[PDB]
Amino acid sequence: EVQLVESGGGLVQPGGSLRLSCAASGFYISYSSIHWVRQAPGKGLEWVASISPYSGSTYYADSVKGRFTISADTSKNTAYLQMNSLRAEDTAVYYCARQGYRRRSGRGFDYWGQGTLVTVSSASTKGPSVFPLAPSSKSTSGGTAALGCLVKDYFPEPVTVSWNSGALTSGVHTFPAVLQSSGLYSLSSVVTVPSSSLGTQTYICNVNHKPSNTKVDKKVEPK
Amino acid sequence: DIQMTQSPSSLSASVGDRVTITCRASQSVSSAVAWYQQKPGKAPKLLIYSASSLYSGVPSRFSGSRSGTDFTLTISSLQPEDFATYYCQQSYSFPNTFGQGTKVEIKRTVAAPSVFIFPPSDEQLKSGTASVVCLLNNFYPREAKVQWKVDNALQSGNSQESVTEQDSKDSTYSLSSTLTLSKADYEKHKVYACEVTHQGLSSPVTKSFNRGE
RNA sequence: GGCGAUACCAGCGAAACACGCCCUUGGCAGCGUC
Ligand SMILES: [K+]
Ligand SMILES: [K+]
C-alpha cells in the first residue's frame, strides 16, 4: 500500500546541481512529515532535511544547510530535494522516508523508499572491459570447478552481473567493487559448478553498466 | 547538534544469544528515540519508537529501554534472520541525528577456504595488462592472509582484495585477491602462486600455475 | 520532612514548528529557606 519512490539521482561534477523527487503512493503526504536521509557507500545513515505538515516548515542538517532545499507539492503528492554546490562528500544513496502517525508510531520513520544513488566526482564515465576467468579444473576431474568474469576499469558504480541471463544464481559470488589507483573500479564475479558440467553447459556472464550505456556478454570456456 | 554515540560498532553473536546495543545521547532527548534495522543492500526498517514501544509487526524478541540519556536495544534470543546493521535515531530536536550503527553478524564454527587461482586471459594480455585472480571460497572467520609469490618472490603493493558479505545460509565469506602487473612484467616470470593462511588450515595452502605451461 | 518562588516534560486535532481545541491539574528535578 504505502510506497515511496525516489528518482533523479546520477553522476555530476563537483559544484553541480541535482533535483531529487520522492513520489508517494498509498497515502497523502499533506498529513505527514517527510524526511531525506542519505547513506554513503558502506557508511551509516545521515539525516539530511525534513518538511512539516500544514506549516511547510523545513529543517536541515548543518552539513547541507544553505546548499539544499527540501520542498513538497501536495497536489503532486511528491517531495523534492534540490541539491546545489555539490561536493564529493555528498556522494550517497538518498532515501525519502515518511515520519509515521503520532499516535501510532511516535516520530519513528515507518516507511522508507529504496533510495536513489547520487555520485559527485570529476571522473568521466567509462564502461568496463570484461575478461574470462577460465574454469579451474578439467571436465573429467570429478569435483567442483570455479569460473568467472573479471569486470575491469569502469566508472561510476554500479554494474550488474548475471550468469546465463539470470538462470544461474546458485553458488555465484559477485564481489564488491574496489577502486584502483587509476580511480576506476574493478570486480570479479565467480561461480562454482560441477566439473562434469563443463562442455555440456554453456556459461555466459552478462554485464550491464547503465551509466555508460554498455552491455557485454562474455562466454567463459575451458582453456 | 545532539550526538548519538552508539556502541559497539560491530559484533558477532551466536544464534540464541542475547544481544545488547547501546546509544547515549549527548544531551536530553526525552524518550524521542527510535531503532532501525537495515540489511545489506536494503532500506532501513523501523523496530522501536519512543524509546521502548515495539513497532507493529516487529517480533517481540526486540525491545528497547531508556535509563536517562542511555538507550538500549535488546534482542532476547538472536535468530538467523537478525543479521543487519542497527541504528538509533533521536527526534527530540532538529537536526535529527542517527547513531553510527552496530553491524551484527552471525558467529559460526571455523571453516577453511577452498582456494582457486586464475591466470590472465589472453584477451587482456594483448591490451598490455595481466590480472591474476585468487579466490578464497566459503570460509569463516573473515580474517585471512593472502600472499602472492612470483617465482618464489614475495609480492607487495600490487594486489587488492575484496570480501563478500556474510552468506545468509552458510554464514561464510568469500574473498578475491587480484594481482596486477604489466604484460612485460608478467612475461618475465614463470611461476605464479597464491599462498593462503587461515585459522581453519593446519598449514598454508598454495595454488599456482606455470606461465605458458 | 515543612514552606516559598521557580525552571522544564505533557491531552487532542492526519499536527515536534506554526495554526485550532482542551487544561489549570498531574510529573520529575534543582534552587531558596526552616
Ligand atoms: K503524520
Ligand atoms: K527551506
Author numbering:
A (entry chain A): 4 to 226
B (entry chain B): 2 to 214
Recite the paper's sentences.
There have been increased efforts recently to “drug” RNA using orally bioavailable, low-molecular-weight compounds. This study combines two of the most powerful tools of modern drug discovery, high-throughput screening and structure-based design, to target the theophylline aptamer, a tertiary-structured RNA that binds theophylline with high affinity and selectivity. That structure revealed how multiple interdependent components of the RNA form a well-defined ligand binding pocket that enables theophylline to bind with submicromolar affinity while excluding closely related compounds such as caffeine (which differs by a single methyl group) by more than 10,000-fold. Previous biophysical and modeling studies have shown that the aptamer undergoes a large conformational rearrangement upon binding theophylline. X-ray crystal structures were determined for the aptamer, both in isolation and in complex with various ligands, revealing the molecular basis for ligand binding.
Therefore, not surprisingly, initial crystallization trials of the ligand-free aptamer were unsuccessful. Two different strategies were used to obtain diffraction-quality crystals. The first involved replacing the GAAA tetraloop of the aptamer with an AAACA pentaloop, whereby the pentaloop structure is tightly bound by the antigen-binding fragment (Fab) of an antibody that is cocrystallized with the RNA. Using the Fab cocrystallization strategy, the structure of the RNA aptamer in the absence of theophylline was solved at 1.81 Å resolution, using the Fab as the search model for molecular replacement. There were four copies of the complex in the asymmetric unit, with the majority of crystal contacts mediated by the surface of the Fab. The individual nucleotides could be localized, even though the electron density for the RNA was lower than that for the Fab. The RNA was found to exist in two conformations, each forming an extended hairpin, with most residues in a stacked arrangement and the notable absence of the theophylline binding pocket.
